[PDB]
A paper describes a structure:
The flagellum is the most prominent extracellular structure in bacteria, with a molecular weight in the hundreds of megadaltons. Structurally, the flagellum can be divided into three major components: basal body, hook and filament. A ring-like structure formed by the proteins FlgK and FlgL, termed the hook–filament junction (HFJ), forms the connection between the flexible hook and the rigid filament. To assemble a filament, [name] monomers are secreted through the flagellar basal body and hook, and polymerize at the distal end.
Author numbering:
A (entry chain O): 103 to 152
B (entry chain V): 356 to 507
C (entry chain F): 101 to 700
Amino acid sequence: DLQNTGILQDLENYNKAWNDFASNPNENATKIALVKASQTLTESVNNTFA
Amino acid sequence: GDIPLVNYDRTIQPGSFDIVIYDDKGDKKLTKTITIDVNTTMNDIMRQINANTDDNDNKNSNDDVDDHINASFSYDAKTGDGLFQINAKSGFKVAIEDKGTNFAGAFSIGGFFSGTDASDMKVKDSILNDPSTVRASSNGVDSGNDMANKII
Amino acid sequence: SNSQTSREAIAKELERIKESIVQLANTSVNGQYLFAGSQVANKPFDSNGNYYGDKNNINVVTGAGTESPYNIPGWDLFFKADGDYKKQISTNVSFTDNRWDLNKDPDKTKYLTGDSKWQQLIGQGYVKDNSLDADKDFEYDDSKLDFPPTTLYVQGTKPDGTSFKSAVLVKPEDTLEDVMENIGALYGNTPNNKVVEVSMNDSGQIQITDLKQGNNKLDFHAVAFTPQADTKDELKNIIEAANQEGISMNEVTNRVMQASTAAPSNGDITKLNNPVTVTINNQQFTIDLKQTDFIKSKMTDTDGNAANGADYDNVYFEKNGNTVYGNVSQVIKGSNAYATDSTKLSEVMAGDSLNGTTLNLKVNSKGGNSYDVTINLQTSTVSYPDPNNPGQTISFPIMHTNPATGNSGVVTGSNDITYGQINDIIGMFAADKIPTTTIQANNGQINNADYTQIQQLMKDSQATVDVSMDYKGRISVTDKLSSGTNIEISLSDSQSGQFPAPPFTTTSTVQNGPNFSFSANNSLTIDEPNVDIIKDLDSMIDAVLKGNMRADSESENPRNTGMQGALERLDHLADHVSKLNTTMGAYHNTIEGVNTRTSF
């Protein structure tokens, strides 16, 4: 976790994007940025597996 | 064309490749496909290609990709050798969508290389003359960067 | 104090600023055009141009099978569907009390409101003497009269998308509230749940705004008809003429309109505009009829008449150079992008089978003369009779391709027929040595050689003319062998012509059955998800130049649209761009993280 590993940080800022999503769901980018942070999260689970 | 596909190459596997006729981006009222297995022969391949292999079936004909197709001959016995051509009309763009068929590029039917090993393996010289032939585009004139990226 | 020329001088900088955006829109990083899609050197726009770039993203591979997109294609700003926004539909006409006349009283110019009972504006409208006393005849009722109703047709798109044919009456003393309650019934704008909002606007018109997010194809057109006596004196007579006959004024309104159609020469089913003479108490009278166009303009219809208000789709394609298009777009049941060739009739129609579905066509050809055709796609059938001998007729059922062979010729199924065949049909209206046919559907079977010969003439016809489905979905045609088109087109449906159920009353009559739309005298609006620079900017510049808060039909531009409309269009655009603005940094900061850990 030199740089707390991406997945745990992907989750973190992803959850930051969540509170942002609470700021304005009508701001679709909150979804997209939120979605992206998980995308790194999930794909990072995927690469570690490999 | 007698030789079966797998017998001419043991990379051939059950697969298909589709053909959507294209402007630099494409269309879907004109589209052909060719089918492959571990048994079929080029003759069958040519039959799917060179026939009324329809793509807009409702019990009539015409108004398809076949609008774009053409063929010709050019040979001389004074040589004892000549050229035979299978083509579609340039001025149209094309794409070919393969799923696990694996034959044409290997046998350089439009492939990059000529020669089989570092004794004769070589770039096709037309590419040596014009790198613009290295258009990054799958889809059109140079309407795609992908191929530059894909070879990364 | 802005004189007209003052407003251009102000507009000039905006025009510079417009090109400033175009310049910015054309920007590159040394040929790495920001707008190119995925292909760097694509110069994307011009002052009068379209988007010129791919729609892939510029991408770089760093992966076990991974690309990396880091731009936005130009269209995705230039003509992008900002789906949050909704239709702004307004009447180009404006409304007032008309006991006063406002040429008597131009300074006054009072607009209608809930207080404006219907009697008041018809006050002088009843008559030509135009001398009716505003209060004692209407409000200081010491001497008030009896009064008849008014008539109205309505056509529009229900926000879901369903079609309807309707007619309704208006009673003599109606107000805004009477209109609203029927409006709720008519559109389903129910008290329990609204779908659109109704307003009287900044400029004196009546405006409606849609609650449906991203609804691009809300449209409206309406026409109202009313009788007209000559004299204030004549009106009091009809009280006694009608009421001792045993009838109020209201029966009289019924008599003249029906008689007009009874012999369409007395005013056709749709062109109802004849003055008529009628019997009341079997006293003889002659009466004038009123015409009302909720889209009124300097209009002569496709027929070339001084267009009668029924002329909604009685207008040709809209002309721009060699390009003409029906501004009444064909739009997707969804993203509200636009049509594709292989779309069968099944995807389009409202019904299990194309029942009673039939269409009519009008073509002012490239060969000058007009060629108009009617088609029953319910039977996949197209037609034309001979002028010299219509008894002889041209027969063609619609056609197709086989599954695997040249074993050809059994006619298309009706529902399957697709849009591409439409554009093909325009190919037939091409030029000079034009074709003809005759066929028999032998169990649907026909001779493909006839089809093939037709096909060959079509494949030669490729060069003549264009059919396009533009960035607004407008039903577009371009004259390829020209830069200015010598062609015009107009289309209509023929389940129309059949109408809502009579007898028509104050309670709305509403029926279904017409299934498609065409080039027509549509409502006015500029705001919707999809953007377009030329319409948005240039139309709104015109209104500033004329100073028209929004519009003026008599103004050379009969669809002057802007100024007040610019407000929310700005509301749309600030969001539209901001979405695009915040999008890019998401790449940038995303890529930073990837590179950084990669670097480490």
